[PDB]
Ligand binder design. Structure first.
Ligand SMILES: NC(=O)c1ccc[n+]([C@@H]2O[C@H](COP(=O)([O-])OP(=O)(O)OC[C@H]3O[C@@H](n4cnc5c(N)ncnc54)[C@H](OP(=O)(O)O)[C@@H]3O)[C@@H](O)[C@H]2O)c1
Ligand SMILES: NC(=O)c1ccc[n+]([C@@H]2O[C@H](COP(=O)([O-])OP(=O)(O)OC[C@H]3O[C@@H](n4cnc5c(N)ncnc54)[C@H](OP(=O)(O)O)[C@@H]3O)[C@@H](O)[C@H]2O)c1
Ligand SMILES: [Cl-]
Lengths: 252, 253
């Protein structure tokens, strides 16, 4: 139902994490198609260069990319990325925290403790540290938009989703704290729950699922566009479902 | 909450309490012993733990055992070693109260110390998970085990300046729900308790201008703690309960 003009994001500088594949890749491509100056973040250089070349072929402007491994980045290793961005851009109008680690799908009694900690580190701790590093740039926007990525399991825990579900609950908590802090300020903060979407992470979570029964990243982009454009400027502290009527769990 | 069980409610129940050296955990340990339980005290401060054990020994004439485990510094191995020590002395665990928690510092996200943030997540989420995992076999030996996590009002709705702590309490609720779902067809029930504003040092740290005399004490909120460990709550799982349902979240006015 949301069909914005093709220049919705013209002149908006938007950073996308996990831009090298799946939903983040589609978000980067789509934001560029809608006029934005996109900044790509990921850990795999070759995958990032590929997405950037795809965007340059269509927009005739090469977007910049930065590699940052959220699992191993120390507190200072995130601020360094913000300094590099600040050297080339005067502000950030949007930040989409899309990067995420699934970890292990299995019972709590078997959850590998190191993997548990890695999931919490990428999805929660490093996501927080990166956010802290980028807030100054976000506050230079006339109406900045900060978006975190949750999941169906971020609102209702489900058996065998261990660290990932716990990390998505944490994500919603973090978003709500930030939304309240910036309530009457220039920055809005919200979460997007994409719902079951056709990506390799989803296929790993549900190996018996038929991915053709799922919506594609392209299909769920309207919400992604809406949160970065001016139509959502009065909305903060909310978790929005990209697929409100989708039955949670494996596709039937 | 007018729950007033018989004084023998927890007779022949082995219950482990973390953060048993002060505040709510200390009160829970004393109260469970008074209601008949064989209490196991966990904390990081040996001297504090010994004092609480002695206090229970003075009244029950049966001194409960204590184990030291620092949740901020423990490894998965150290949790298994404690569960192994417990299994050596006890045949099961009928209850586990995860009461231990770290507040961190009240302040905006832009100012949050990343090391303190990590410390809060480590104690409240990661170490709480590791200990849970280590204790599941003992809990499953109970006829009706009860696993209880401790949340907060900010674990249901995030508010400004609560940073790592609010985030960790959301995580706590999530972890509890995963566990409840996994054990719903087994003998173990899993729930959360939100004690509400209670007169403790952590509460004073969270609200430095609050008059603590306007708060209920840990003793005053015990009915829910007893209820969750006794047979009257055996068909309840996956829920988050408020010890003070008639209190508006926030500073005491
Ligand atoms: N697809 C779904 O059904 C679904 C449902 C609900 C929520 N989500 C959420 O949607 C987001 C995107 O996931 P997706 O399905 O698109 O999965 P995906 O294709 O695996 O993409 C995940 C992205 O996160 C990046 N990433 C993982 N670990 C990283 C690290 N340590 N440092 C930096 N980047 C890292 C990945 O980089 P690499 O390319 O190097 O792997 C990748 O770009 C996640 O937050 C996920 O939890 C997805
Ligand atoms: N008081 C409230 O108004 C309130 C409200 C909502 C939720 N809660 C929750 O209630 C629980 C109890 O809090 P409280 O108010 O009783 O706080 P408290 O008086 O500070 O007690 C905290 C307990 O946790 C233990 N602890 C802290 N860090 C530890 C560590 N690294 N390793 C092992 N144990 C550690 C403490 O040990 P030490 O004795 O060595 O310091 C202490 O026994 C917490 O989970 C808290 O989040 C409290
Ligand atoms: Cl021993």
């Amino acid at each position: 139902h949301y069909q914005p003009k093709q220049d919705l994001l013209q002149n908006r500088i938007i950073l996308v994490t996990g831009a090298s594949d799946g939903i983040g890749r589609e978000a980067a491509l789509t934001y560029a198609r809608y006029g934005a100056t996109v900044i790509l973040l990921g850990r795999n250089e070759e995958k990032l260069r590929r997405v950037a070349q795809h965007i340059a072929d269509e927009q005739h402007v090469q977007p910049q990319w930065f590699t940052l491994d959220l699992l191993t980045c120390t507190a200072e290793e995130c601020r360094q990325v913000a300094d590099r961005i600040a050297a080339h851009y005067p502000r950030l109008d949007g930040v989409l925290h899309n990067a995420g680690l699934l970890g292990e799908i299995g019972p709590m009694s078997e959850q590998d403790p190191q993997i548990w900690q890695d999931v919490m580190q990428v999805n929660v701790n490093a996501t927080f540290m990166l956010t802290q590093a980028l807030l100054p740039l976000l506050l230079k926007s006339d109406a900045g938009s900060l978006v975190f990525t949750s999941s169906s399991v971020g609102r209702q825990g489900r058996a065998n989703w261990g660290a990932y579900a716990t990390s998505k609950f944490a994500t919603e908590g973090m978003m709500q704290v930030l939304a309240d802090e910036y309530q009457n300020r220039s920055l809005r903060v919200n979460c997007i729950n994409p719902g079951g979407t056709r990506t390799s992470m989803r296929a790993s979570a549900f190996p018996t699922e038929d991915p053709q029964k799922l919506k594609t990243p392209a299909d769920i982009m309207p919400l992604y566009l809406w949160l970065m454009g001016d139509d959502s400027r009065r909305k903060t502290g909310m978790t929005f479902d990209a697929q409100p009527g989708r039955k949670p769990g494996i596709a039937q």
